[PDB]
């Protein structure tokens, strides 16, 4: 079991949206109840999807209502993190962690260009 992140780094503009791919193999048919997904950013949880239960942790989360896991991508084996209305603070090293049978992780860097 190994996850593939084709893009190692993403460069985006302040105020825009970004979707960071994180793909895992589905042999035959997907059992959401066996799937665990965490996205972190430098020892800070962005979002999690654990056996069908999603938690944004918007308890003073820095991504209160801007982070999501589109389920049309989850079902295709892509645990993509979508961040809307990006801010400078969002730049950094993200970690995508998946457990589906086995477990693996990939680091992904986000760069945010500011206005002039």
Curated annotation (Swiss-Prot):
Disulfide bonds: 22-96
Cell compartment(s), UniProt: Cell membrane; Early endosome membrane; Recycling endosome membrane
Ig-like V-type domain boundaries: 1-109
Glycosylation site list: 17
Induction (UniProt): Up-regulated by IFNG treatment in monocytes. Up-regulated on dendritic cells, B-cells and macrophages after activation by LPS and IFNG.
Post-translational modification: Ubiquitinated; STUB1 likely mediates polyubiquitination of PD-L1/CD274 triggering its degradation. Ubiquitinated by MARCHF8; leading to degradation. Deubiquitinated by USP22; leading to stabilization.
Tissue: Highly expressed in the heart, thymus, skeletal muscle, and lung. Weakly expressed in the kidney, spleen, thyroid, and liver. Expressed on activated dendritic cells, B-cells and macrophages. Expressed in numerous tumor cells lines of lymphoid origin.
Listed result of changing residue 82 to S: No effect on PDCD1 binding
Recorded coiled-coil stretches: none
Function summary: Plays a critical role in induction and maintenance of immune tolerance to self. As a ligand for the inhibitory receptor PDCD1/PD-1, modulates the activation threshold of T-cells and limits T-cell effector response. Through a yet unknown activating receptor, may costimulate T-cell subsets that predominantly produce interleukin-10 (IL10).
Subunit: Interacts with PDCD1. Interacts with CMTM4 and CMTM6. Interacts with CD80.
Similarity comment: Belongs to the immunoglobulin superfamily. BTN/MOG family.
Protein name listed in UniProt: Programmed cell death 1 ligand 1
Source organism (scientific name): Mus musculus (Mouse)
